[PDB]
Structure formats: C-alpha cells, structure tokens
C-alpha cells in the first residue's frame, strides 16, 4: 500500500536522522501502530526523564492526523490524564508533509515550552511558573506512577 510505503519511508528517515533523545518503531506486526520514546531535553525540568508514546495511523493518513498519546503518565500543562496531548500540529495545523520525526521533535519541544494558555492539566499549568517546585513534584510523582 501507498500509506504503508510512506510509513516505511518515514521510518527510514527517522533511522537515518540521528536526532537526540527521540526514537520510534512499529509495534510488532503493523506499520500502523508504533511506539515512540522521548527523553526530556537537557536544561529542562524533564531532563533525565523518558516517556513512551503510542502513535496510531488511521485510514486516511497522511491527510488524517495520527493519534498520538503518552503511554508513560506525563505530568505536563498540555497533557491530560489519559495521555492526550494538546499540540496544534496534531489537530488543526496538521500538514500531510509532517512525518513521525517531526511529531516527536515537536512533542519533545512541547515538554520544555508548554502553552499555558491552552492547559489540559491546570495544576501543572499553575505550578509551571515555579520550576524548582515543578521539578520536585514531577520527579517525585514520575516515580510514584
């Protein structure tokens, strides 16, 4: 299939790109469900933390955005309890040129620069302005959950 061909190419591009602290790979059988891994960037409160994500590619992909969710519970202003991410490029700003690598780099970037005006977690949004308290709470509850 053309969509499967496309996803094979996105995989190879990601494999060849060597971007730091991001990775992904088709989960077992299907080209249509992958697991990703994102490490928090150095300098941010997420440094030293890593998160697994699921990426599911719907009928209609590349024109229909993939469904991307945190599998690892992620305490962040823009992430809900179910692992849903409020990220512009995953909904209204989705472009059919975007690939997996783009999505992972955008989420990694969202970790260190949340959008506080569009919170899915209000506790985290309010705590964000206090980075030592945010980091302590984040690190100590990453361990709990």
């Amino acid at each position: 299939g053309p969509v499967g061909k496309r996803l094979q190419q996105e995989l190879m591009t990601l494999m060849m790109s060597g971007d730091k602290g991001i990775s992904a790979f088709p989960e077992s059988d299907n080209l249509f469900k992958w697991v990703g891994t994102i490490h928090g960037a150095a300098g941010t409160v997420y440094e030293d933390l890593r998160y697994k994500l699921s990426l599911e590619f719907p009928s209609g992909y590349p024109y229909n955005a993939p469904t991307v969710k945190f599998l690892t519970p992620c305490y962040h202003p823009n992430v809900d309890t179910q692992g849903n991410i409020c990220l512009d490029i995953l909904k209204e700003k989705w472009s059919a040129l975007y690939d997996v690598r783009t999505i992972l780099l955008s989420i990694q970037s969202l970790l260190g620069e949340p959008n506080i005006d569009s919170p899915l977690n209000t506790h985290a949004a309010e705590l964000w302005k206090n980075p030592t308290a945010f980091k302590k709470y984040l690190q100590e509850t990453y361990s709990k959950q």
């Binding site: 094979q8 995989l11 190879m12 494999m15 060849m16 990775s23 790979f25 992958w34």
Partner: protein
C-alpha cells in the same frame, strides 16, 4: 553490504529502545519487513543475523538473557 549491516544495527537499536526486548525471530521479521522489503532493499538471512547479534553480545553492545536480546 557495509552500508547494509551498519543500517541493520541502527534499526536494531531503535527496535530495542522502543520495544525493550526481542527474540531473534522478532528481530529477523522486523528487519525483513522494514529493511529487506523496505525502502533500503537490503538482504539478510537468519544465520548471518544470528552471527551478527552474537558478535554484538560478545562486544557488549547487546545483552542476551532469558532467550531474548536487549540493550545494555
């Protein structure tokens, strides 16, 4: 062939990073689907792959335990 075997190692590292541990069979099948019949069009057979992963385990680039492979 060189670009092939180094490419295989890149994909093997990602498979293991994301899926955490895999049997020889699963590694083999993923390389077949995503590399051999993938855009790279790169050939590998099972014996060669097993020898390769074994050399990686000798050199401690890979761990083999409980019948499966893992990253150290």
């Amino acid at each position: 062939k060189e670009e092939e075997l180094l490419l295989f190692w890149t994909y093997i590292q990602a498979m293991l990073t994301n899926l955490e541990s895999l049997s020889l069979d699963r590694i083999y099948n993923m390389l077949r689907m995503f590399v051999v019949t993938g855009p790279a069009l790169a050939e590998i057979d099972l014996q060669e792959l097993q020898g390769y992963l074994q050399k990686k385990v000798r050199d401690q680039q890979l761990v083999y335990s409980a019948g499966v492979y893992r990253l150290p």
